[PDB]
Ligand binder design. Structure first.
Ligand SMILES: [Ca+2]
Length: 150
């Protein structure tokens, strides 16, 4: 295809970011318009945050470009989280201490957070005994959360 997934890392990271960017910047015009962003926040993020998500990030920096997400999260703690950070955030904000050991030990460190996949296969799923609903939903929405909130 024209769009060609080069490496699995970009498939996870670039495509995750491309997908969320497309969901907010529908036109991917290179600027997530705060009003565009609002629509994706209104449900997917709504499970946690609705107006504050944009008020914190898009407080000024509204129009976020596809590349901007990359640098944004690159310069955000989410991507810098190690195995201890990731898991502490998991039980603290996810409340799933029954799988923290699996993730941590299988070696999860700020990885599956920007490497979850909404439509494609995720990363955490391989690193958990079962690619079950609770696992995917917990991390998909919470990773979506930490990525898009930063
Ligand atoms: Ca747009």
């Amino acid at each position: 295809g024209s769009h060609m997934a080069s490496t699995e890392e970009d498939r996870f990271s670039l495509e995750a970011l491309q997908t969320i960017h497309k969901q907010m910047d529908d036109d991917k015009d290179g600027g997530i318009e705060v009003e565009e962003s609002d629509e994706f926040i209104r449900e997917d993020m709504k499970y946690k945050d609705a107006t504050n998500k944009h008020s914190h990030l898009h407080r000024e920096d509204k129009h976020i470009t596809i590349e901007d997400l990359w640098k944004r999260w690159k310069t955000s703690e989410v991507h810098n989280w190690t195995l201890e950070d990731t898991l502490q955030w998991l039980i603290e904000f996810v409340e799933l201490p029954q799988y923290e050991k699996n993730f941590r030990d299988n070696n999860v460190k700020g990885t599956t957070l920007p490497r979850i996949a909404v439509h494609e296969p995720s990363f955490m799923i391989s690193q958990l005994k079962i690619s079950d609903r609770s696992h995917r939903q917990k991390l998909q929405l919470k990773a979506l959360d930490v990525v898009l909130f930063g």
